[PDB]
Ligand SMILES: [Cl-]
Ligand SMILES: [Cl-]
């Protein structure tokens with residue numbers, strides 16, 4: 001584990017992360033997809049061998065010795081708010097189990113279901129709070145990746161408020 005486990009946020013492509021493993025915002029079919037998923041496919045294509053997994057779950061595939069944890073958040077265009085909220089919380093709980101099993105000291109993670117699976121809604125607080133609920137009991141250093149400048153400021157504020 002990290003000596004003083006922390007949360008940090010960076011505004012840049014998660015495919016350039018400086019952590020021991022990455023979480024992909026995957027689709028259930030293991031397809032290249034769009035957004036974070038497509039960047040992950042371009043950087044670690046070998047990790048998409050048998051990466052298909054249901055909504056609300058995470059499945060890790062190695063690219064060399066580097067773990068890619070494919071976490072499938074719900075698409076809020078298809079799910080109700082209640083069911084989607086439950087599956088989004090579940091995907092993050094599965095990421096925490098995988099990070100613990102892998103024994104890594106750090107993990108790069110995107111906010112699941114905030115892009116094309118958001119159903120056109122701002123889900124920063126919803127998704128980030130489910131990330132904290134799952135990851136708080138782990139001792140890995142967590143680095144959250146985002147692309148929007150206003151989202152970077154809001155995620156940073158939420159991290160600092162709890163310290
Ligand atoms: Cl970048
Ligand atoms: Cl998304």
Ligand SMILES: [Cl-]
Nearest residue numbers: 146147148151
């Ligand atoms: Cl973003």
